[PDB]
Design a protein around this ligand. Structure first.
Ligand SMILES: Nc1ncnc2c1ncn2[C@H]1C[C@H](O)[C@@H](COP(=O)(O)OP(=O)(O)OP(=O)(O)O)O1
Ligand SMILES: [Ca+2]
Ligand SMILES: [Ca+2]
Length: 268
DNA sequence: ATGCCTACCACACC
DNA sequence: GTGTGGTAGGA
């Protein structure tokens, strides 16, 4: 209620060919206005400008059409998915830690330990069954930063929205947050030596952008790619490429339609 | 013409 | 030691 008000208060302050939808907007609110008026299943992507800052331009189109002009990786570099507020979404993680500050850290093993804990939490709290085979593991690491994105592919399950995902993780990670069951493997140090969590809990905000599979930040050149030890394999289909399957799986807001979907909620 | 909002501190107040 | 409130900085 107070979330919408500020959203529209800032909007006034800053105020035959084949079927193809490809609309750009300078403001995020305009893009979502178009989505509400479009009868097709279109979504909002955030595109970083040539400027060095985090200035974004917003694209609206379908997943199929976006992938058409995106897969070559010649154009549409540095793209982000906009996770809409109040939209059902998958369980996803942003994992980071500075390598110099953590010499003994084995990120590959912290990830495995994290997945096991989260899978146990989902079982005890929601009766949801899942394992590492249901977790799309993406990597964007460099010499200086260990970086991974995890996107859970739960069978006929989703969270009410990404805010509720955050509430779920803050709840089950409260032990680790106190260090700042034994969750100490999640504790890492940043460039200044301050103890932080291996799980970045700041990416569960309204309209959070989330770097797309095979995209990099405008400053760098390292793009998100399926990790070497990734264990989620989409069901192969003769009608779509494997890469498109991974793309769809990687989209946090692309909740597969199911006639028996369970929606998980979690309040603060 | 990007969006979002927590960690942090200064200040009452008890 | 609780309670707001007001802002700069990171994602
Ligand atoms: N300045 C910004 N404005 C808007 N959204 C942002 C901004 N910075 C980051 N985000 C969003 C997009 C990112 O995918 C997400 C997580 O940020 P962050 O972890 O810093 O980068 P990343 O996880 O995409 O790559 P990496 O972690 O490897 O640098 O938050
Ligand atoms: Ca990250
Ligand atoms: Ca992060």
């Amino acid at each position: 209620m107070n979330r919408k008000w500020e959203a529209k208060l800032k909007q006034i302050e800053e105020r035959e060919e084949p079927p193809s939808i490809w609309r750009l907007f300078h403001r995020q609110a305009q893009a979502f206005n178009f989505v509400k008026s479009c009868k097709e299943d279109v979504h909002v992507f955030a595109l970083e400008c040539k400027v060095g800052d985090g200035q974004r331009i917003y694209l609206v189109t379908t997943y199929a059409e976006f992938w058409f002009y995106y897969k070559s990786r010649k154009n549409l570099l540095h793209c982000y998915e906009v996770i809409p507020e109040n939209a059902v979404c998958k369980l996803y993680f942003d994992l980071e830690f500075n390598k110099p500050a953590n010499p003994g850290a084995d990120g590959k093993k912290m990830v495995a330990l994290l997945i096991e804990y989260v899978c146990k939490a989902l079982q005890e709290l929601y009766g949801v069954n899942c394992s590492a085979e249901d977790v799309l593991n993406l990597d964007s690491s460099t010499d200086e930063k260990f970086s991974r994105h995890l996107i859970f592919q739960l069978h006929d399950v989703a969270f009410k929205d990404n805010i509720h995902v955050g509430n779920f993780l803050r709840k089950i990670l409260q032990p680790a947050l106190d260090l700042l069951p034994d969750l100490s493997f999640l504790v890492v140090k940043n460039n200044m030596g301050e103890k932080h969590l291996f799980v970045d809990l700041g990416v569960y905000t309204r309209n959070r952008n989330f770097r797309l599979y095979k995209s990099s930040k405008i400053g760098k050149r390292v793009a998100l790619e399926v990790t070497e030890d990734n264990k989620f394999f989409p069901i192969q289909s003769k009608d779509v490429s494997d890469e498109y399957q991974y793309f769809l799986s990687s989209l946090v807001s692309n909740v597969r339609f199911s006639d028996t979907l369970r929606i998980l909620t979690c309040e603060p």
